[model samples]
Target chain A: TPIDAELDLMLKRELAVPVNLVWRGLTEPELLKKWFVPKPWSISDCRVDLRPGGEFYTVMQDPEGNKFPNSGCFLEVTDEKRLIWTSALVKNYRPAVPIVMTAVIELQPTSSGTRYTACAMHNTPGQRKLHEEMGFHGWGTTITQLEELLKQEK
Target chain B: IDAELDLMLKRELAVPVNLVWRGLTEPELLKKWFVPKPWSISDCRVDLRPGGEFYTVMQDPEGNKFPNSGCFLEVTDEKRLIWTSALVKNYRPAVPVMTAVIELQPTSSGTRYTACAMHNTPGQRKLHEEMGFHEGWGTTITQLEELLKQEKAY
Candidate 1:
């Protein structure tokens, strides 16, 4: 049971990007839309109501007209520093007023660029474990998409 | 190999392959980018679908835990899924063994997914194939992209 009971899991990486761009990409809707999805997809109609109980939406879609709705609330916002929000699943483009899980995203200005850290705190251990299996490295790849987006903008 | 499985996943958000593939194995990244938009994963304990319990618990945006716990039945990178552990608690082990062959092949876009669930009967196999598992599984490749994009803001 020793080897069997031992926890088997992994956390992929640390991304360092230009500070101002990272901040802008995270805070500004236009910037976010650029690199959010890989090519053939783009973010549209993004609205942010950043307040403790405020709501936000950053709906995404593909060129073929596939739509995915993402809505949530702001738990804490440290301008140009840190942002904490709750993301609960949404449907029909309907924005959920109160957020669900407390997601904390912190941004630090580093010599090379910005250190962006995203932490999603679940209410239960089971919930945390489930998310771990889903894999964000796939999502992390999108950061490169963001870089591409930034280039186009420049 | 002709097709790199990780590349296709990365093309979604144009993220790096290392990050993309690692995301699948890494718990934190897996959780951040796995589910569809809006809904977040609360907890997860991955036996790697390997040595021990392969069961997975996923909490939905509406506050629901979809616990899929099974033993590592079988795992070969992205090529196979054969598991059991369903019978041990008691009751004559139903479908004592569940096997699946998931292949990551080359595609102009990146890679193609072809999976077959091992079954004693061709009828059961046909049922699963008819269920559009291909389209559903394929859809998630991009759905995961949306999750990444949505989380990109952080």
Candidate 2:
């Protein structure tokens, strides 16, 4: 279903773990590969340089071994709190793809666990809607897997 | 004319919606991140409701201050907010810039934050893009996320 383009497409989840635990699940390569991409599409290679203008790139492989590359630079990274990155720019804020959008992940301390927010910002309404159709819900699935991974660590 | 001259930027943040809400509404908190670093918001007044006032004086790196006043067109607690620079207090006409609508939705862990800017003309829209509106806005959001995190840590 299409939503108003003027609004953002957002996904949220509550994880039964501390913010730092969830943060590692996102930035740590070993932990990220465990839940970053949805199942059946595993991360083949993942690298992260946690800093402004740092690199965060991942290559995912489907069950059939087909590869998809996701590349971008980190715009901001606050310890155990938030991360902002975008495919629109690479290291040193150099422009990359014109169709690229920025992504923000926020983690807040909740009463019982951590509050997670996953957001994507696109250049146009059509693009935003297209992303929503593409796999915004996959974020929910991905986060669930993250929770599962955290549970395993506990 | 109903010509579509608008831009929307959406991102997911790891912070809770209430924190985002406060970051936008509270004057002191807003002053910290509303503008770029070295620049600052010197004065702010927000009523947080339809027809309410939204005013601020932003300082530049050179210490020059630019004052802006607007009115809220819509406000839904921690959910949606609409304000415009096209109208000032009492809905009086001003040099029309843009109308911004921000939507925040609860995510599994935090909030889904979306921001849309509607320009009155093609020129205005183009100007906004050239002015680095997207990057500026993205930075502000990052600042907000970091601010909330630091506040909570302390």
Candidate 3:
């Protein structure tokens, strides 16, 4: 199947953890701060309102303490199954900067644990290209980190 | 009619660009100036990036409520913001209105700001001009000034 390379970028990982743990890892602030970003790029001040039009804001900081603040709002939220958010607004839907993509996090319960699918949907080929350039594989690495966190907790 | 640049608002504010930028993006600060008095934003959420969502629920004096859902097209910190109601969150189609561009230039004392509305046609631009775009947005600009006076630098 020819996916619209211009519109979507996605990665899938089968984890040995239940959807419950994945949901907690994505929704809870403390869990997200632990493994949301890859190592050397720590996340600080992760805030989630967890509803339509609610905020899913975060600060991604480098080792040098340079902070990149991101304010996104949740568009669709379903407990332990899926979550969709975008960076199009900060809160209550006001303009931010640099539209990159919208994120859809889908967690399906598998026979073992869970199947994690992270999708980044872009507006244009140019935008998709930029995401590709910015290293979409970072999410793969973060999922590994998330796997680590989930194991430790279990 | 005039080069397709019809509805616009320009102002020289006494606030610094950074502070004014904060006013533009901060959820709490934006509610103070996004609209004039008697017309208040009951709720707002912003994604703070392109492909991000910009949403607000406006309440009129008569208690009539209007909801505007938009997507940010561009965001440059302390410089520019562009969004359109023609698309809802993530470039999804909606009722077309106008795309808005707000540019800010830092001056010796404060900030010079320009807010321009772009429509699909000159007639749409002309219609907005006649609709008191000046009075409507001008008052909001003035309202933002008052907000800045009381707003602390934090």
Highest DockQ scorer:
3
All candidates: DockQ: 0.01, 0.03, 0.04
lDDT of 3 by residue, B1-154 (tens): 2357446788999888988888888878888789887899989999998658899999989999999898786788999987777557765434316668799999998999998876655667678878878899999999887788787555
Can you tell me which runs of candidate 2 are displaced by over 4 Å? A1-7, B1-154
In what order do the candidates fall by lDDT, top score first? 3, 2, 1
TM-score of chain B of 2: 0.92
Q: Model 2 over residues B1-154: C-alpha lDDT tens digits?
A: 2245667778888888888898878888988998978788989998776546899999989989999887675667898877766545533334316667789998988778898877745777789889988898888888888899888654
For residues A1-154, what per-residue lDDT tens digits would candidate 3 score against the true structure? 2235667888999999888888898899999999988888898689999876578889999989999988886766789988877765445443343245567778889999899987877667777787777775587888999988989885
lDDT of each: 0.49, 0.75, 0.78
Clashes of 3: 27
Candidate 1: Cα lDDT at B116: 40
Q: In terms of lDDT, which candidate is strongest?
A: 3
Better model by lDDT, 2 or 3?
Answer: 3
Candidates in order, TM-scores: namely: 0.39, 0.49, 0.54
Worst 10 residues of 3 chain B by lDDT: B87-96
Worst 10 residues of 2 chain B by lDDT: B87-96
Q: Please give the lDDT score at residue B105 for candidate 2.
A: 94
Candidate 1 DockQ, CA atoms: 0.01
